[PDB]
Design a protein around this nucleic acid. Structure first.
Ligand SMILES: [Mg+2]
Ligand SMILES: [Zn+2]
Lengths: 129, 155, 81, 260, 150, 184
RNA sequence: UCGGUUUUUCAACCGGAUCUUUCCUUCUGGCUAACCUGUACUCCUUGUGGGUGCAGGCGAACCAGGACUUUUACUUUGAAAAAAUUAGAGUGUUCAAAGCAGGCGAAAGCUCGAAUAUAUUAGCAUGGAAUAAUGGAAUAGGAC
């Protein structure tokens, strides 16, 4: 079995980026993945995503800018506290200030900076750049 | 839990310091005393309707409830007035950022008022050390999952 | 290969791929109405019929299911509807 | 093991005494008293270090045994007498009267008061029991008992004691929207008006408290001590009005007051 | 991935979109239901019923035309098998294997296959027990399986 | 007509619709006896931005099948008689609220009473027997949800010049931006 | 303006409030405070500037009383975690480690002190309800 759909999607995206291909096909998709993509779009890491979210499960096709470098996951979604977020950023993000650690928080799925602004940490979902 | 055969023992069971008048008969004959335990845990009507005994009872005995109230799963009733409740867990190990799973077999007292079966969510409150291990006693028993008595055989 | 539209696939490309692998998971199977040489009205038969089939009243074999599709006996006329 | 602890070590001592950790290895353990060891403040800690009226234990003894010192009413011959909260210390020399009230940051500040307010103690109601013969008695937070009170006195209420006699003149009923004092924990010595109660079942009962600077803080009823109506206190408060100022504010104050 | 034997195998039956019409494949739902009921009465499994429908009548899925699936419909009208189809089939298979073993014992491959089948049954059985279908404690050995047969 | 058609009480639009229905009945054989089970709930004459108007009718959910059995011709007649205002038939589906973390959860809440599925159902209904074969969704760079609705080329003459109006109606109903399309 | 101070024009960033086609445990009332209100009308600039005021009628601004509440795992805030130590303020122990004092007048006597922050996890109360399980009404003994 595929256990983490989001992870697989991210892997696919990464592979596409590596290739230089400017379109993907996320296979099972839906909800969390969609939200992640939305967040990415907000900062403009992916160009435009369109899903044949049909009568089954959903299939996302991402027309992407290619400016995205890498987009991770971590499937043991660790319960991030408001202080060790810095540590996480240091570990995961390349630059000190460029890039976004994706957090699934009670306030919703968004990047790290936005979470900080709302002062709600949650669980790590992934990261871009 | 027990149920039926009330006084039948070596010593005849009495609710202490409380008395029923044998001179004149009123309406429902016997007065059995009961306390409203508190903390919003509803009293069972079966405790008043059905006349057992039990000194250890939260409701009909001189047992009080103050402290910590825990909830767990009923595992063992192969006993008498006693119940083994498995408490669940997530013990966080700092080293790996991850959670363990652990078992705590909290042994508690089951009042004859309450009907309890193996494999149910049960609320238990602190008490006077009533046995070697038993320091808790039943407060409320919910349904097994959602169905009350619908579990039956095939067509 | 730079850009391929994975939302508007061409009529040949889709045909090349099988059944489920296409963007819309749809059956390749078109199940048919039959006009047998005996009866006077239409009856429905599946292209991949699994078991033996009878027309209407008389026990007349329409299709023998071998492998994928159904071997339509003798020669009957049929439409996709 | 074996029995009760008699000595006390100058490190194991409570924090809001600010005793010199180096000079001396034993602190004064306050004796058996009205207030809790943690809450209470002994006389030698006070007299020797807060006021600087003495410099040695011998000196303190001399001060005490000559019987110029009076706490709430009586003299108290012993050194290690527990004086906690709201307690009045009247010294016969120059009539320098004090009430032991906390400061902004948690210290028993040397608050100098005249004989007018230094005549009554405020006392929190711990419990109300009907004693022998069928007599209601009220329990003060300083262990003290007053037999026959006002019938409408409940717990968490606060009561005036005239010191000269063990009698109640007036009491402040516990009400949301009545100015208050906090006596323990992380937030200590701050003053607010009480917004809302949290009743709760089975131990620990919280109240939300709001000050003049719009900063909410929630505290247990154990450390909550009512002072009176919002606006009017029954006790004169220490300098800075006893409001827990921010570190930035403190810094500003420091940088504003360079005067010689 | 196909459980026991190695081999992926993507052999899968597709289901189309629009779970409502196939309009020119006529016949009211009631008629279909009645047909299904008749089939059940004659003694056929839901899968078998479906196959029959595929063969003869203008149907696509019963979940499309009627509001319910076939098994659900059967349950509603109280005409469901004792042990839910698949399980029954598995038990039959197991019985057959046991018989074969009895006939000739040294066939170790056969024994292995029997073991596999038993395991599969157990796997199925546990889940069935969980979803309140079958009464608690269900044995699947020669003492009960033989009795069951059909 | 106040109890036969309205199922409620007020509104001039309702009265107009009732009148139209009555007029339709006066044909006599096929257009009177075949349609006496129908009930007409809330009607909203909702407008397309710059142009014509659209009569958005809500009808009972226990029926709908009945409407499908009739419809089409009736709709055409309505279009003809009430001048250039596009008639649309919809179902009054409730949408039960999301089970909050607080609040007493009365029942499981049916999957038929959700939001998204209900909306999809409405969309399916709104397109008069033509049927959807793909609900593809574009999500723009700004953060806008726009849905393509794939329609089969077999019989599109019924709608044709009503697509924009349909889209507008959908927007008015929900806020979701809708587009219709036909492949080669 | 005598380096700080707030309106406006604008951006951004949340937060809460909303009716939205879509609900906050629910009332038994306590109590209402404000108007959907208006009963009389007016102090007064030709009047929706301004509200004292009781007979139909706002729930939340908390009180106390039931009735039942799917539960958790998270996370936020708060309360806690005795001091010494560590981190860290302030302070010329001749500096430094130190300590917790000292510093300032006219050097004839009045005030700033001695902060705070973490120390995670187990319980404690709240804010959040995305994530992850868990459970609702199928032989309805189901809901109001
Ligand atoms: Mg240091
Ligand atoms: Zn023939």
């Amino acid at each position: 079995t595929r256990t983490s759909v989001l992870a697989d999607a991210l892997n696919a995206i990464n592979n596409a980026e590596k290739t230089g291909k400017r379109q993907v096909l996320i296979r099972p998709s839906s909800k969390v993945i969609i939200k992640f993509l939305q967040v990415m779009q907000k900062h403009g890491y992916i160009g435009e995503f369109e899903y044949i979210d049909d009568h089954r499960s959903g299939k996302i096709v991402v027309q992407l800018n290619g400016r995205l470098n890498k987009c991770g996951v971590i499937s043991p979604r660790f319960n991030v506290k408001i202080a060790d977020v810095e540590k996480w950023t240091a570990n995961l993000l390349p630059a000190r200030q460029f890039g976004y650690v994706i957090l699934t928080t009670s306030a919703g799925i968004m990047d790290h900076e936005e979470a900080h602004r709302k002062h709600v940490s949650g669980k790590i979902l992934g990261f871009v750049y | 839990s027990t149920e039926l055969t009330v006084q039948s023992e070596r010593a005849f069971q009495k609710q202490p310091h409380i008395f029923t008048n044998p001179k004149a008969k009123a309406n429902r004959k016997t007065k059995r005393w009961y306390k409203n335990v508190g903390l919003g845990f509803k009293t069972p009507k079966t405790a008043i309707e059905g006349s057992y005994i039990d000194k250890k009872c939260p409701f009909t005995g001189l047992v009080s409830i103050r402290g910590k109230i825990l909830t767990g799963t009923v595992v063992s009733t192969r006993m008498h007035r006693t119940i083994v409740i498995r408490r669940d867990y997530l013990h966080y190990v700092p080293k790996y950022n991850r959670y363990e799973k652990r078992h705590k077999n909290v042994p508690a007292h089951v009042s004859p008022a309450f009907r309890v079966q193996v494999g149910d969510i049960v609320t238990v409150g602190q008490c006077r050390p009533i046995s070697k291990t038993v320091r808790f006693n039943v407060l409320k028993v919910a349904s097994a999952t959602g169905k009350a008595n619908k579990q039956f055989a095939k067509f | 290969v730079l850009v391929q539209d994975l939302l508007h696939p061409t009529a040949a490309s889709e045909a090349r791929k099988h059944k489920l692998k296409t963007l819309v998971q749809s059956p390749r199977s078109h199940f048919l109405d039959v006009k047998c040489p005996g009866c006077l009205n239409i009856t429905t038969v599946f292209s991949h019929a699994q078991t033996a089939v009878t027309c209407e009243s008389c026990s007349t074999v329409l299709c023998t299911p071998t492998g994928g599709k159904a071997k339509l006996s003798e020669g009957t006329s049929f439409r996709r509807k | 093991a074996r029995g009760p602890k008699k000595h006390l070590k100058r490190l194991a001592a409570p924090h809001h005494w600010m005793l010199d950790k180096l000079s001396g290895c034993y602190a004064p353990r306050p004796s058996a008293g009205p207030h809790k060891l943690r809450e209470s403040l002994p006389l030698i800690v006070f007299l020797r270090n807060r006021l600087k009226y003495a410099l040695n234990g011998r000196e303190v003894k001399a001060i005490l045994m000559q019987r110029h010192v009076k706490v709430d009413g009586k003299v108290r011959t012993d050194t290690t007498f527990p004086a906690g909260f709201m307690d009045v210390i009247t010294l016969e020399a120059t009539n320098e009267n004090f009430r032991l009230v906390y400061d902004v940051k948690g210290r028993f500040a040397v608050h100098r008061i005249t004989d007018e307010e230094a005549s009554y103690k405020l006392a929190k109601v711990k419990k109300v029991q009907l004693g022998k013969k069928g007599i209601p008695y009220v329990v003060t937070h300083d262990g003290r008992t007053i037999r026959y009170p006002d019938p409408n006195i409940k717990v968490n209420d606060t009561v005036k004691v005239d010191l000269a006699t063990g009698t109640i003149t007036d009491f402040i009923k516990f009400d949301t929207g009545k100015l208050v004092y906090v006596t323990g924990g992380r937030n200590l010595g701050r003053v607010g008006t009480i917004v809302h109660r949290e009743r709760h079942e089975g131990g620990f009962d919280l109240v939300h408290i709001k000050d003049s600077l719009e900063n909410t803080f929630v505290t247990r009823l154990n450390n909550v001590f009512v002072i009176g109506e919002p606006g009017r206190p029954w006790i004169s408060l220490p300098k800075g009005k006893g409001i827990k100022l921010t570190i930035s504010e403190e810094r500003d104050r420091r940088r504003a007051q360079h005067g010689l | 991935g196909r459980m026991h034997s190695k081999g992926k195998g993507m052999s899968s039956s597709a289901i189309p979109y629009s779970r409502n019409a196939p309009a020119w494949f006529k016949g009211s739902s009631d008629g279909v239901v009645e047909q299904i009921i008749k089939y059940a009465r004659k003694g056929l499994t839901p899968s078998q019923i479906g196959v029959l429908l595929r063969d003869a009548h203008g149907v696509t899925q019963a979940k499309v035309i009627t509001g319910n699936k076939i098994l659900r419909i059967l349950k509603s009208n109280g005409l469901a098998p004792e042990i839910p189809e698949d399980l029954y089939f598995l038990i039959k298979k197991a019985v057959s294997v046991r018989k074969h073993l009895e006939r000739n014992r040294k066939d170790k491959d056969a024994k292995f296959r029997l073991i596999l089948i038993e395991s599969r049954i157990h796997r199925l059985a546990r889940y069935y027990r969980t979803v309140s279908v079958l009464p608690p404690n269900w044995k699947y050995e020669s003492a009960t399986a033989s009795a069951l047969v059909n | 007509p106040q109890a036969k058609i309205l199922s409620q009480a007020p509104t001039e639009l309702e009265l107009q619709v009732a009148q139209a229905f009555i007029d339709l009945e006066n044909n006599s054989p096929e257009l009177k006896a075949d349609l006496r089970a129908l009930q007409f709930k809330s009607i909203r004459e909702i407008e397309v931005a710059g142009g014509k108007k659209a009569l958005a009718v809500f009808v009972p959910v226990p029926s709908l099948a009945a409407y499908h059995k009739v419809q089409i011709k009736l709709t055409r007649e309505l279009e003809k008689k009430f001048q250039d205002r596009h008639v649309i038939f919809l179902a009054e589906r409730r949408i039960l609220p999301k089970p909050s973390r607080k609040s007493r959860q009365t029942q499981k809440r049916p999957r038929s009473r959700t939001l998204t599925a209900v909306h999809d159902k409405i969309l399916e209904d709104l397109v008069f027997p033509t049927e959807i074969v793909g609900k593809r969704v574009r999500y723009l760079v700004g953060g806008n949800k726009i849905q393509k609705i794939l329609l089969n080329s077999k019989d599109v003459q019924h709608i044709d010049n009503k697509l924009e109006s349909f889209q507008a109606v959908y927007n008015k109903l929900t806020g979701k931006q809708i587009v219709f399309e036909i492949p080669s």
